[PDB]
């Protein structure tokens with residue numbers, strides 16, 4: 710996260726870390742057995758880390774759980790990043806408490822201007838690379854579809870939204886992918902892609918979770 714602040718330990722109880730011997734993506738807990746993340750974070754060997762603040766120190770409150778399976782959206786397109794969503798089933802059910810809790814799915818899409826909380830352990834630099842130990846947070850509005858499309862003409866599908874600041878200085882960055890975008894208590898977005906980090910007129914692009922609620926529900930029911 711570039712331009713954000715320290716969240717505070719366990720204040721984003723639905724944030725997960727995907728680990729393969731290092732932190733490579735984020736994700737959100739949506740029930741005791743399932744995490745949502747981005748299709749592009751897809752790899753074998755994933756250990757889901759819940760209740761993490763400092764990802765380098767065991768502090769207490771962590772639960773380390775192997776993914777049992779990862780489900781990339783069948784229509785995911787790695788050139789376009791259209792349908793950039795993935796579900797991960799935990800080998801066993803997390804223990805839900807105040808530190809480790811699930812985020813609700815929206816029942817309707819958010820409008821332009823809604824303020825959301827984005828969070829991750831990704832690079833905190835616009836230029837160069839500086840990874841934090843602790844979770845960082847950012848408040849960012851959802852931009853209008855007109856602005857989003859005039860920033861990335863021919864690249865925005867109806868399953869993507871833009872959020873952030875046209876002025877540069879504040880954004881998600883390398884490391885943050887798969888992580889939540891939460892707006893009024895629901896998960897509206899997934900960190901997906903952009904152009905550099907916190908560059909002027911190049912806001913971050915997010916997966917539009919409201920378009921996937923049925924798919925999520927349907928796939929979880931059958932697995």
Ligand SMILES: [Ca+2]
Nearest residue numbers: 763766767768
């Ligand atoms: Ca830790």
